[PDB]
Ligand binder design. Sequence first.
Ligand SMILES: *[C@@H]1O[C@H](CO)[C@@H](O)[C@H](O)[C@H]1NC(C)=O
Ligand SMILES: *[C@@H]1O[C@H](CO)[C@@H](O)[C@H](O)[C@H]1NC(C)=O
Lengths: 228, 319, 35, 84
Amino acid sequence: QKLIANQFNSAIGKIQDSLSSTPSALGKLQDVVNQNAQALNTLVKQLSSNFGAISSVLNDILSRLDPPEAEVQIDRLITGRLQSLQTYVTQQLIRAAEIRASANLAATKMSECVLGQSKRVDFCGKGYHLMSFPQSAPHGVVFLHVTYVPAQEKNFTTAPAICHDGKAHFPREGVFVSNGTHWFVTQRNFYEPQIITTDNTFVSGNCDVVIGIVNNTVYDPLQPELDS
Amino acid sequence: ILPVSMTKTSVDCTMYICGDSTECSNLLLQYGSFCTQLNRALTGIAVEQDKNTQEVFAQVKQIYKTPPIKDFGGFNFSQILPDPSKPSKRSPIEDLLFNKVTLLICAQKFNGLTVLPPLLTDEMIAQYTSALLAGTITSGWTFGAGPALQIPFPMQMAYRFNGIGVTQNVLYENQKLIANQFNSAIGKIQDSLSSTPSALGKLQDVVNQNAQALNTLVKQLSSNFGAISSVLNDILSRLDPPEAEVQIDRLITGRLQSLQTYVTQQLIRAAEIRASANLAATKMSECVLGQSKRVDFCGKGYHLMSFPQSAPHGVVFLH
Amino acid sequence: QIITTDNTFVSGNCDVVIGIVNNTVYDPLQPELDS
Amino acid sequence: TPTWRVYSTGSNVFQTRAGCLIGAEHVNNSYECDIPIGAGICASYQTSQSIIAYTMSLGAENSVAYSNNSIAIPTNFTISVTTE
Ligand SMILES: *[C@@H]1O[C@H](CO)[C@@H](O)[C@H](O)[C@H]1NC(C)=O
Ligand SMILES: *[C@@H]1O[C@H](CO)[C@@H](O)[C@H](O)[C@H]1NC(C)=O
């Protein structure tokens, strides 16, 4: 508990620091604003083109020309501006589709990695997803994930089963890791190993089929001490 | 089969619309920024058409290998693993794939076309997939979360079974049989693919579509768009600029419009390819570096494991 | 349900866990089975 | 301008499937990618100082020494916290 706590706490400290100093990890949120500003900026700048007329100012076209033709220059400007608007709106639609995608993705990632311990690997974050935490952000959301990352190996030598009384005892919840000497401690993912009672095993069959069985004893926790 | 890319291409706007024609260029400028953004959008498409590849065949972090002795209880997968003989280290399946999916180019180049080369050439992509696969054969559901832990392969298939619902017992006992079933099935795969009942189909449409679109574009650079001609030179060799303007504008308008159409199509397709690549990225990191209980989200029926395989412009999963 | 050694399991001593409430445990065989 | 003149000549040229980038150096080593060009060839600054282009490296070569009967258990666990 404390030694797990300590880790959690310190690590949250890091999340701050990695997003506190000036490492710009908020690129994905910045890009949206930059793209939108650029689009609006271009749309505004498109007003200074005359699309092949004499000028790009309406007050200027009327004051040097006669309405018989003026319409042609005006129509030119009209067409140009209109096309520009079309382009802007179309790219806005396309971008909105992507933002909607990113949303639905996020919405899922919420439901699962924040109201549950969803298993699916690399959908909450690298490792196994203990728990998460959401944090809102300018035009977006930021997830924190608290995961389980194993380290510090031990390359022990397993077997596949333990035949003791001519019958084959398969392992219940671990993968029987006969460590170097007394070949029988039965672990489980981590390292806590205990002796093979007939309660972490489950008998099945005879000792010829599963190739690789290595005999020794399967201890029985009942008879030989309470024979009263 | 799943597509994960698209031939990244752009088109130098100006030289498309105008051909070298200074007067044309000038007239074009007048039309505002209306093709800086064009080129920009295409470039954005390209960048995405690369990051896609990164998302899928690059979620490993450490290229692994395989032991020199093949003591796997019995599985003979020397299909999926790379075979030294073939030049670019490629599994036989990968080869069959490449050779099947196949397709002027420099000619349409001579119109403004450009087909930028990928950042991840094939050999590297293969190498990544080989890594992943190798990791799976001897790390199980671990090299995708934390370090990489060796587990003997019989001994690993058992735990996946345990996942399915059958208890370890089954596998360890009737090992011989399941070995053979696996063996032969892998055998059949090369046939089914190497046959031609529209196998690598989806990976082919991407190409056909793109090519076709590009071709349409080029062809449109031959339509007078309702102007005197469509070569720009004959206008500028029969007329003075005063009158030239008229025809020149007619053309410029038509050509620009076409270029628009093309880029908008390209964008809408790139969105779909991105969706497909995201689906891949999941499929990989949920049905390749780990079992998944999402029915059919890894394949038909209960799922034991998968194997990825690289194919032109796309991933080919062997579930 | 009554606490027996059938629905629980043993691990370690009783000065490491916080809040372990050390209080009783029944056993399946401990009755007349222990004749 | 005579400043564009140095960037069209010289002994520093390395043809690539990408193209003919000039002002580079095709070292025989391999590092992790930086500014990405295409077809593998990457480039980045280094150490007396010059933009180098290198055939990118995919990562450190490992080999999970697996035998036929040896399982490996992790014996301590570090709780990271990641961001997205
Ligand atoms: C709960 O907290 C109290 C302090 O208010 C403490 O005395 C007690 O031991 C705690 N019980 C636990 C942790 O089970
Ligand atoms: C790189 O290696 C090749 C052959 O191995 C050699 O010819 C060349 O001079 C080397 N270049 C440098 C810069 O070391």
